[PDB]
Design a protein around this ligand. Structure first.
Ligand SMILES: Nc1ncnc2c1ncn2[C@@H]1O[C@H](COP(=O)(O)CP(=O)(O)OP(=O)(O)O)[C@@H](O)[C@H]1O
Ligand SMILES: Nc1ncnc2c1ncn2[C@@H]1O[C@H](COP(=O)(O)CP(=O)(O)OP(=O)(O)O)[C@@H](O)[C@H]1O
Ligand SMILES: [Ca+2]
Ligand SMILES: [Ca+2]
Lengths: 196, 198
């Protein structure tokens, strides 16, 4: 648990259109919707042996390579598989929320998905204090993964060069250098095929 | 830790610093761990002393709740949230003074650390969110989004609250009043920068 420098793979996912969709229902409904979603994401992360760092509203942060050790290639394989399984889940969910009147039906479009994945060094371990301490990762690598998730287009998966080097060339749909805050050197990003 | 999601009037506090990464770069790891911890330690103590609830940490950002899980009057929620925000800023200044005296800031010149805090009071679905496999206690809803947007909109080393919060704060303690259009929200919001001192 004690914080230490380690090569890990960070995954940030987030959905847009949740509050808009929940704006209709009451408290009970908003909670059901969110829990439904959160459960699916968690399932995708665990099934791929990933670590659910935390939830940030309707955003999810997962780690691969901590606390349990994992090779750089497995970290990426599993991070990618999680991101793709998440998308399939959102498709299933959106299908259900549409047949149920929460989508398509009159001004609350389906919920779009955004996922960012990066691999790099990060101080990982327990951070906080006596009042509160949580297991997480800190550092530019984490910052980068978060910025990729926010920079990518709707319903897509964007990764860094460090991650893409383990991905079959035919799976990289688009390449583009992005200027990310706090980073001087432009970052080469790669949108990957959400299927396989 | 057992509270099922339920609607409730609460006060949400979001604080965030800028300069940690920069300060920790010209540094080396179990020193970025002790640094963030030193900072986090000060922030959480400010929340605990004011009986606030530390919802979670988002990197070097802090989320605190007032009015949950333990009930709290709407006036007490604001008094304690305001007091927390002011104490944090004081602690930050104390921290920068220390880091300055350690060459952690103001050398290889990483500017001193900046502080931002946003506070808002409104309805929110509070309780445990997630699934049987994983769930945490937090608040959800437009009210939470607002508090977050207020913190990201205010200027460095300042505290910005919404009208709902300002109504409990002495008029003379309100430094500035101005309408700002927050993301994803239809009606502009009345923002009020409070004086860092009582
Ligand atoms: N329970 C919670 N814990 C931590 N942060 C939270 C939170 N609920 C909301 N937030 C914060 O509130 C803000 C919400 O604004 P956005 O992320 O821009 C909304 P969005 O994702 O674009 O649409 P959406 O809410 O429909 O999904 C974010 O800054 C988020 O981190
Ligand atoms: N341990 C962690 N858990 C969750 N989110 C994290 C995190 N570490 C970093 N992040 C995310 O990484 C991103 C960092 O970007 P910013 O918040 O803009 C950095 P900053 O506050 O401007 O400067 P700073 O890092 O020097 O404080 C945010 O989206 C933040 O929420
Ligand atoms: Ca979102
Ligand atoms: Ca920050």
């Amino acid at each position: 648990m004690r914080p230490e420098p380690r090569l890990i793979t960070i995954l940030f996912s987030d959905i847009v259109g949740f509050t808009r969709m929940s704006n209709a229902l009451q408290s009970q409904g908003v909670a059901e919707l969110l829990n439904e979603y959160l459960g699916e994401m968690t399932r995708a992360v665990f099934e791929n042996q990933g670590t659910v760092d935390k939830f940030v509203g309707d955003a999810i942060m997962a780690l691969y390579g901590a606390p349990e050790e994992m090779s750089p290639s497995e970290q990426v394989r599993r991070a990618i598989a999680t991101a793709r399984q998440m998308l399939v889940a959102l498709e299933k969910l959106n299908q259900g929320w549409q047949e149920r009147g929460l989508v398509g039906r009159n001004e609350v479009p389906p919920v779009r998905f955004r996922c960012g994945i990066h691999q790099g060094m990060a101080v990982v371990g327990l951070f906080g204090s006596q009042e509160r301490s949580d297991f997480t990762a800190i550092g530019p690598s984490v910052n980068i993964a978060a910025r990729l998730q926010e920079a990518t287009a709707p319903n897509s998966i964007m990764v860094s060069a460090m991650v893409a080097q383990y991905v079959p060339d035919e799976e990289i749909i688009k390449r583009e250098f992005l200027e990310l805050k706090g980073i001087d050197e432009p970052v080469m990003t790669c949108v990957i095929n959400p299927n396989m």
